[PDB]
């Protein structure tokens, strides 16, 4: 008797009608692993403060990488909503580990503290962060984004 497919994703809503298993004791380990990934994603999304298909295709990264080279219908009011999400994916600790490797007075330290504070401030208030990112000079916004993207790229690729 196999794990209920609805239960693996969350909670089965079929009531006593369901033929499949809802008893985690009898499940193969892989079901239990997959389920905790759905469940953790759900727990996360519901502590949040939140064509349009073309944008989805690109991805937040695709969207930001566009606005840097001014194409594919890239806009500010939207690039900032993408930026906001990127920063949500990042945490401060990795930036500090990167910061600990730069020699003294090396200028990157200052970008790192700016990104860090973008992360922290994005966590307090995404709307006022976007408000702020939407207030910047285009060339300076494009530099913030350029830099955060790099940071994002390099944390993962090792």
């Amino acid at each position: 008797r196999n794990p209920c497919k609805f239960e693996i994703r969350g909670h089965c809503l079929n009531g006593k009608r369901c033929h499949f298993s809802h008893n985690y004791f009898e499940w193969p380990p892989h079901a239990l692993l997959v389920r905790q990934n759905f469940m953790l994603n759900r727990i996360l999304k519901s502590m949040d403060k939140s064509d349009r298909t073309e944008e989805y295709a690109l991805g937040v990264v695709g969207v930001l990488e566009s606005y840097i080279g001014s194409i594919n219908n890239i806009t500010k009011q939207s690039a900032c909503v993408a930026m906001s999400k990127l920063l949500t994916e990042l945490n401060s600790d990795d930036i500090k580990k990167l910061r600990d490797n730069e020699e003294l007075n090396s200028p990157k330290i200052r970008v790192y503290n700016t990104v860090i504070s973008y992360i922290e401030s994005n966590r307090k208030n995404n709307k006022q962060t976007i408000h702020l990112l939407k207030r910047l000079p285009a060339d300076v916004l494009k530099k913030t984004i350029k830099n955060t993207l790099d940071i994002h790229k390099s944390i993962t690729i090792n």
């Binding site: 200052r110 970008v111 700016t114 504070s117 973008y118 401030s121 307090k124 006022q128 962060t129 408000h131 702020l132 207030r135 910047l136 000079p137 300076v140 530099k143 913030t144 830099n147």
Partner: peptide
């Protein structure tokens, strides 16, 4: 009068 988002505005300019 000082809020965090306005210092962070000026912070971004002085840095980039």
């Amino acid at each position: 009068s000082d809020n965090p988002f306005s210092k962070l505005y000026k912070e971004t300019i002085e840095t980039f």
